[PDB]
Amino acid sequence: GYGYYRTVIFSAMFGGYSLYYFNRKTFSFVMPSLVEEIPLDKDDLGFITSSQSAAYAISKFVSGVLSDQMSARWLFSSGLLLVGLVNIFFAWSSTVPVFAALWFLNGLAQGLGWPPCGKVLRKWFEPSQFGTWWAILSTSMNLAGGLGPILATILAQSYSWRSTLALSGALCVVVSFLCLLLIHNEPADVGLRNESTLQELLLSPYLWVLSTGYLVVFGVKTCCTDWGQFFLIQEKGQSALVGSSYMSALEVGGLVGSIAAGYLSDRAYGNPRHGLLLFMMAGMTVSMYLFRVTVTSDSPKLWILVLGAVFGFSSYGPIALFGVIANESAPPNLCGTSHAIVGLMANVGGFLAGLPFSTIAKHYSWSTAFWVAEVICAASTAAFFLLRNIRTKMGRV
Ligand SMILES: O=C(/C=C\c1ccc(O)c(O)c1)O[C@@H]1C[C@](O)(C(=O)O)C[C@@H](O)[C@H]1O
Numbered sequence: 001g002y003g004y005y006r007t008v009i010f011s012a013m014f015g016g017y018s019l020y021y022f023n024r025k026t027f028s029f030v031m032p033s034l035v036e037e038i039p040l041d042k043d044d045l046g047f048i049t050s051s052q053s054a055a056y057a058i059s060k061f062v063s064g065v066l067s068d069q070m071s072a073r074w075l076f077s078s079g080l081l082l083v084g085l086v087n088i089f090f091a092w093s094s095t096v097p098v099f100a101a102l103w104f105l106n107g108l109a110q111g112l113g114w115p116p117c118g119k120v121l122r123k124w125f126e127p128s129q130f131g132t133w134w135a136i137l138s139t140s141m142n143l144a145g146g147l148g149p150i151l152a153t154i155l156a157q158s159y160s161w162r163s164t165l166a167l168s169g170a171l172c173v174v175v176s177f178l179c180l181l182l183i184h185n186e187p188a189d190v191g192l193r194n195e196s197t198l199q200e201l202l203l204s205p206y207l208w209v210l211s212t213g214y215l216v217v218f219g220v221k222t223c224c225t226d227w228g229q230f231f232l233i234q235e236k237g238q239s240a241l242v243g244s245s246y247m248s249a250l251e252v253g254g255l256v257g258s259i260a261a262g263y264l265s266d267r268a269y270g271n272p273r274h275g276l277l278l279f280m281m282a283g284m285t286v287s288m289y290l291f292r293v294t295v296t297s298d299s300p301k302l303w304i305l306v307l308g309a310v311f312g313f314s315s316y317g318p319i320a321l322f323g324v325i326a327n328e329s330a331p332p333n334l335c336g337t338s339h340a341i342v343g344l345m346a347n348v349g350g351f352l353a354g355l356p357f358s359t360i361a362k363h364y365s366w367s368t369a370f371w372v373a374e375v376i377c378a379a380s381t382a383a384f385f386l387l388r389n390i391r392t393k394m395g396r397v
Contacts, residue, residue, distance in 0.1 A: 001192070002187070002192070005124075005184065005187070005190060005192075006124055006125075008182060009120060009124060009182070009183055009184065010133075012178070012179050012182040012183050013076075013116075013117055013120060013137070013183070014137070014140050015175060015179075016076060016080055016113070016175060016176075016179045017113070017117065017137060017140050017141070018140045018141075018143055018144045019080065019083075019144075019171065019172050019175055020079075020080065020083065020110060020113055020144075021140070021141045021144035021145065022144040022147075022148055022168065023083045023084065023087050023106075023110075023168060023169070023172055024083075024106070024110055025144065025145065025148055026087060026148070026152075026164070026165050026168055027048070027049075027052075027090075027103065028149075028225065028226050028229070028247075029148045029149050029152040029164075030152055030156070030161045030164060030165065031045065031226075031229070031230075032229070032230070032233065032240050032243065033156045033161040034161050037161070038094060040096070041362060042358040042359070042361050042362040043355070043358055043359060043362055044096045044099075045354075045358060046354045046355040046356075046357065046358025046359065047096070047100055047354070047355055047358075048096070048099050048100050048103050048354075049103075049226070049353070049354035049355075049358075050351055050354030050355040051100045051101075051103055051104045051107070051354075052103040052104060052106055052107040053107065053347065053350050053351035053353075053354055054104075054107070054351050055103075055104040055105070055106070055107030055108045055111070056107035056108075056110050056111050056347065057107075057111075057344060057347035057348060057350075057351060058108075058111070059107060059108045059109075059110070059111025059112065060110075060111035060114055060343065060347065061111075061340060061343070061344050061347075062111075063075075063111050063112055063114065063115055064114065064115055064336070064339075064340050064343070065340065067115035067116075067119065070115075071185055072115070072116035072119045072120055072183065072185050073116070073179070073180050073183040073184070073185060074180070075112050075113065075115070075116050076112075076113050076116045076176075076179055076180075076183065077176045077177070077179050077180040078112065078176075079109050079110065079112035079113040080113070080172050080173075080175060080176035080179060081172070081173055081176045082105070082109035082112075083106060083109045083110060083169075083172055084168075084169040084170065084171070084172030084173040084176065085169065085173070086102050086103075086105050086106045086109065086169075087106070087165050087166070087168055087169035087172065088165070088166050088169035088170065089102055090102050090103075090106075090165055090169075091162040091163075091164075091165040091166035091169070092162070092166075117137060119185070120183070120185070121133050121134070123185065123186050123187065123194075124186075124187055131262070131324060131327070132262075134323075135258065135259070135262055135320065138258050138320065139255055139258060139259065142251050142252075142254050142255035142258060142316070143255070145247070145250075145251035145254070146248055146251040146252055146255070148247075149229075149244040149245075149247045149248050150244050150245065150248050152164060152244070153240060153241060153244045195331075195332070195333050195395075195396070196331040196332075196333065196334055196394070196395035196396050197396065198334075198337075200394075200395055200396050200397075201331060201334055201337065201338065201394060201395065204391075204394040204395070205387075205390060205391075206329065206390060206391060206392050206393075206394060207338065207341070207394050209384070209387055209390075210322060210325065210326055210329075210342060211341060211342050211345035211346075212345070212380070213318075213322065213380065213384055214319075214322045214342055214345055214346040214349065215345045215346060215348060215349030215352075216349060216376065216377060216380040217281070217284075217315065217318050217319065217322070217346075217349075218319070218346040218347075218349045218350045219349035219350055219352050219353045219373075220284070220288075220315070220353075220373055220376070220377050221315045221316075221319075222350050222353040222354075223353045223357050223369075223370070223373050224250075224288070224311060224315070224373075225247055225250060226353075227353075227357060227358075227361065227366060227369065227370070228246065228291070228370075229243045229244070229246065229247055230243070230366065231366040231367075231370065232246055232295075232304070234366065235365070235366050235367070236295055236296065236297060237296075237297030237298075238297075238304075242301060242304060245301070245304075245305065245308075246304055246305070246308045247308070249304075249305040249306075249308040249309045249312070250308040250309065250311060250312035251312060252309060252312070253308065253309030253310060253311070253312030253313040253316075254312035254313065254315060254316035255316070256313060257280075257312060257313035257314065257315070257316040257317040258316045258317065258319070258320050260317070261276070261280075261316075261317035261318075261320045261321055262320055262324070264276055265320075265321060265324065269389055269390065269391055269392065270388055270389045270390070270392060271325055271328075271329070271392050273321060273325070274388050276317075276321065277317075277318055277321045277322075277384075278381065278384065278385055278388070280313075280314045280317045280318050280321070281314070281318060281377070281380075281381040281384070282381055283310065283313075283314040284311060284314035284315055284318075284377065285374055285377045285378045285381060287307055287310045287311040287314060288311065288370070288373070288374045288377065289374055290307060291304075291307045291308075291311065292367065292370050292371065292374065294307075295307070322342070323342075326338060326339060326342050327339070329392050329393060329394060330394065331394050331395040332395075334395075338394070357369050357373070360372065
């Protein structure tokens with residue numbers, strides 16, 4: 001029976017990939033309480049996040065390159081176990097070098113679990129149904145972003161910050177074991193039946209336009225999430241519950257954005273679905289400007305929630321659009337390399353959000369850094385609008 005095994009395996013990957021993201025973002029979930037008991041400046045936080053981002057970038061790139069000669073279940077279980085172990089260790093350390101080393105290892109382990117999902121999806125599902133399943137997998141990510149912050153704060157009001165990560169880590173370990181028991185690599189182990197050149201790929205302007213757009217979008221999203229959580233409390237006179245609700249609403253909006261963008265793009269030199277992407281980017285920068293300027297010490301909370309949801313929608317739509325367009329325009333025999341390059345550029349964009357942004361905020365203010373980010377986003381949107389009727393097919397032409 002294909003259906004039974006498909007359902008079981010997909011549920012197992014859903015749970016494992018949700019725990020992956022939860023343990024990845026636990027630091028952003030608890031950061032305010034940890035800063036409250038251990039006095040730290042913005043530079044230390046930026047250093048830790050940048051170290052994790054760099055480690056994840058290198059590990060994911062190399063694992064994606066060499067994934068063709070490893071088993072999916074073992075890699076998934078190993079990665080989950082290592083992430084749980086480093087999360088458990090994090091709950092006992094109380095210094096800035098140990099935190100940075102532990103999160104570097106966290107990124108290294110988190111980079112391992114990406115290729116197995118694609119391998120299982122390709123082995124167990126039809127080639128014409130990849131993206132759809134990809135889509136729902138992305139929703140799991142958003143789910144981990146939604147339940148994470150608020151619960152953490154709810155636990156923080158009566159328990160230590162160190163009593164959450166540790167518990168989370170334990171869960172991962174247990175789930176990892178269940179994952180190995182519940183994941184089969186191919187529909188044959190159970191028993192039931194189963195051009196261009198590299199010099200021409202990198203010499204395509206559209207390949208760099210897409211990469212730079214993804215870089216900008218990912219960096220701006222990471223900046224908004226972590227440093228707006230801190231911005232709402234440290235400068236706008238709001239409490240930590242509002243800071244957590246802002247991120248929860250951001251992820252709630254991002255879920256519906258990721259779900260819808262595929263439908264709107266599919267119903268609709270250049271690409272047919274560039275207008276939706278440009279509109280979403282414009283909405284993202286407009287919402288950023290409104291959030292920076294309108295919110296004061298005395299403002300209703302459902303205005304902040306609306307701003308967060310709108311930004312999440314306008315940020316998570318373009319990510320799916322970028323992925324689908326990169327898959328569609330890729331050379332016929334170089335899809336994996338193109339996906340790896342675009343992911344690497346998105347990861348370096350996310351890396352740029354940690355330390356330089358925190359240093360700018362430390363020197364001038366949070367407002368100045370957010371204004372710089374919004375200015376960069378507006379300039380990128382204008383440039384993308386200008387550079388939109390160029391060749392979209394990459395390769396030997
Ligand atoms: O391949 C994909 C994504 C979707 C995809 C694949 C085959 C398809 O046939 C399809 O319709 C859709 O990679 C994802 C997007 C990524 O940014 C990229 O594409 O560069 C890299 C990484 O971030 C991944 O999340």
